[PDB]
Amino acid sequence: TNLQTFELPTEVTGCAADISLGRALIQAWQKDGIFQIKTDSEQDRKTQEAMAASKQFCKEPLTFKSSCVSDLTYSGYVASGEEVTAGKPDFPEIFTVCKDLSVGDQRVKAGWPCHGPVPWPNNTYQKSMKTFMEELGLAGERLLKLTALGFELPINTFTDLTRDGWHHMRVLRFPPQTSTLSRGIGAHTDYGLLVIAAQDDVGGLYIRPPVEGEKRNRNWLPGESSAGMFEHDEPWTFVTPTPGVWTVFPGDILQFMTGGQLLSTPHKVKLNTRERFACAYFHEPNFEASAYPLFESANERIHYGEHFTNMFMRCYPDRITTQRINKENRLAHLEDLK
Ligand SMILES: NC(=[NH2+])NCCC[C@H](N)C(=O)O
Ligand SMILES: O=C(O)CNC(=O)C(=O)O
Ligand SMILES: [Fe+3]
């Protein structure tokens, strides 16, 4: 399937044109599971600078890369083969950028799970990634206003959840395939409101569109992980690399809040004949936000930070971050926040 591309206005005000655009965005997700947004010169420049920083960092020796880790936050380095999806190793190397909180921050002092300072490789890499993430966040907020408008909801419905949102980014390098291994990342869904992603010209992202009659697991429930689901089953859409766009698809929270009117798009990565750089950005609720059903009055909620924490613990069962959460009973804070 050949994807739709939209140009977003710099500001979303709720004018009648914004409602029509929002309607189109929703309908593109309901048809294809994904759409593209055009990038302007600055958005593209910041994307390329981040990609270049990623390539330069990956050239560092492994001993140095592996030192960029923290027992407070999941930010930092993930070696190729380290992450687990559905019990199988994923092959990118990754640098994850979560909210960059100093040890003087009150949430860090209180010992909240996943809160702490990014173990940056250096200040030059830091600046490239922070500038990119700030730009990505402006796009996320436009998209959330448009999504609310397309559902004829109050314009701030989703952005009210993203104040000091737990936005984060996975800066990825996928190695080349071998004749017997081509799994980059197993099939999965991501966890928050939106996923905005950039990729180089190599290719390897596949997404699953909505399928009439197909039951979808609710990955915010422990008994219904979406990891590995549909891995070997049609249909999978190849997201062809296209110059001058970012891709956008929903995460688990949007699926929950919309009652399945939007689905959290399953996706996976195949290793190609060349190494592949990509960046995946997650526009998320505040860690303390409680997502709720928009169209139902049911009692179910998703505590976003609980979902993030549960997911990252399953991704990284042996990481020092996970060990410290378990040792210090940091999950108790979530019970308290709830
Ligand atoms: N941290 C991530 N977004 N990881 C994406 C891959 C899927 C992840 N390993 C999982 O089990 O859910
Ligand atoms: O590499 C890509 O284009 C897709 N990346 C992801 O889905 C991810 O890391 O969660
Ligand atoms: Fe993903």
DSSP structural state of residue 222:
G
Q: Single out the residue of 241, 217, 56, 246 nearest to residue 137, CA to CA.
A: 246
Which range marks the domain in which residue 332 is found? Answer: 1-338
- Residue matched to tokens 């730009």: 135
Give the Å distance between the CA of 280 and the centre of ligand 2. 6
How far is Cα 264 from Cα 182, in angstroms, rounded to an integer? 24
**Pocket of ligand 2 contains residue 68 by CB under 6 Å:** no
User: Hey, how many other C-beta atoms are within 10 angstroms of the C-beta on 20?
Assistant: 11
Which of left, alpha, beta for 86 (phi over 0: left; psi -120 to 50: alpha)? left
User: Hey, how many other C-beta atoms are within 10 angstroms of the C-beta on 181?
Assistant: 12
**Pocket of ligand 1 contains residue 189 by CB under 6 Å:** no
Atom in ligand 1 nearest the alpha carbon of residue 219 = 12
Give the Å distance between the CA of 136 and the centre of ligand 1. 20
Ligand 2: which of 96, 205, 270 to mutate, most ligand atoms within 8 Å of CB?
205
DSSP bridge partners of 279: 171, 198
Write the single-letter amino acid at 60. E
Q: Single out the residue of 98, 263, 90 nearest to residue 166, CA to CA.
A: 98
HSE at residue 36, side-chain half, CA atoms within 13 A, is: 18
Is 333 labelled a binding residue? no
Give the Å distance between the CA of 208 and the centre of ligand 3. 12
Give the Å distance between the CA of 14 and the centre of ligand 3. 30
- Number of helices (H), then strands (E), in the chain: 9, 16
HSE at residue 241, side-chain half, CA atoms within 13 A, is: 14
Tokens of 267: 């996706």
- Count of residues for the chain? 338
Q: Single out the residue of 71, 52, 289, 272 nearest to residue 171, CA to CA.
A: 52
In degrees rounded to 5, what are phi and psi of residue 84?
Answer: -110, 135
Torsion sign, CA atoms 192, 166, 116, 125? positive
Rg of the chain over Cα atoms, rounded to whole angstroms, equals: 19
Contacts of 109 (CB under 8 A, 6+ apart): 103
Q: Please state the domain count of the chain.
A: 1
**Pocket of ligand 1 contains residue 185 by CB under 6 Å:** yes
Give the Å distance between the CA of 253 and the centre of ligand 3. 14
User: Hey, how many other C-beta atoms are within 10 angstroms of the C-beta on 215?
Assistant: 8
Q: What is the DSSP string of 240-290?
A: ---TTEEEEEE-HHHHHHTTTSS----EEEE--SS-EEEEEEEE---TT-E
Is 267 labelled a binding residue? yes
* Sequence-ordered strand ranges (E) for the chain: 5-6, 35-38, 76-78, 84-85, 88-89, 93-97, 168-174, 183-188, 194-199, 205-207, 237-238, 245-250, 267-270, 276-283, 290-291, 302-303
Write the residue with the smallest CA distance to atom 3 of ligand 1. Answer: 190
Q: Single out the residue of 122, 277, 301, 82 nearest to residue 198, CA to CA.
A: 277
**Pocket of ligand 1 contains residue 311 by CB under 6 Å:** yes
How far is Cα 33 from Cα 110, in angstroms, rounded to an integer? 39
- The answer to whether 289 touches 227, Cβ cutoff 8 Å, is no
